[PDB]
């Protein structure tokens, strides 16, 4: 049959400053050090572009959230000027990129996807 998530690629939401921003709420915790979408408001460019709550950010506005901090994620968004691109993944999508040794960057959703048995793909890990 047809599989709803056989195209396992991160969704890209593009929104621009409307009211006091892009229309999404980022939550920060002393347990979850990374940033995640807490809430989206109906009348927002974020909601319109297909962003939801409880979505997690892997890249924002072309910047990679590879262990990035609160200041880093804000820097990525603010550097976009008046508009931003949000990459979010659900647990199903998140695990796939991890197991394939790759960050779910925008290049994967638009272009090529990695492969299993990722011993053939020479990941550049050296030193301990």
């Amino acid at each position: 049959g047809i599989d709803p998530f056989t195209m396992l690629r991160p969704r890209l939401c593009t929104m621009k400053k409307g009211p006091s921003g892009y229309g999404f709420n980022l939550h920060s915790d002393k347990s979850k050090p990374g940033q995640f979408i807490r809430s989206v408001d109906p009348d927002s460019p974020a909601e319109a572009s297909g962003l939801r709550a409880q979505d997690r950010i892997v890249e924002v506005n072309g910047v990679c959230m590879e262990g990035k901090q609160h200041g880093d994620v804000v820097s990525a968004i603010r550097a976009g000027g008046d508009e931003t691109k949000l990459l979010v993944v659900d647990r199903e999508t998140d695990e796939f990129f991890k197991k394939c040794r790759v960050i779910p960057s925008q290049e994967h959703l638009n272009g090529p996807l990695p492969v299993p048995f990722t011993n053939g793909e020479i990941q550049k890990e050296n030193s301990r």
Binding site: G21, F24, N25, L26, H27, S28, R38, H70, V74, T84
Partner: peptide
């Protein structure tokens, strides 16, 4: 606290 955008 949070951060809204």
């Amino acid at each position: 606290q949070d951060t809204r955008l």
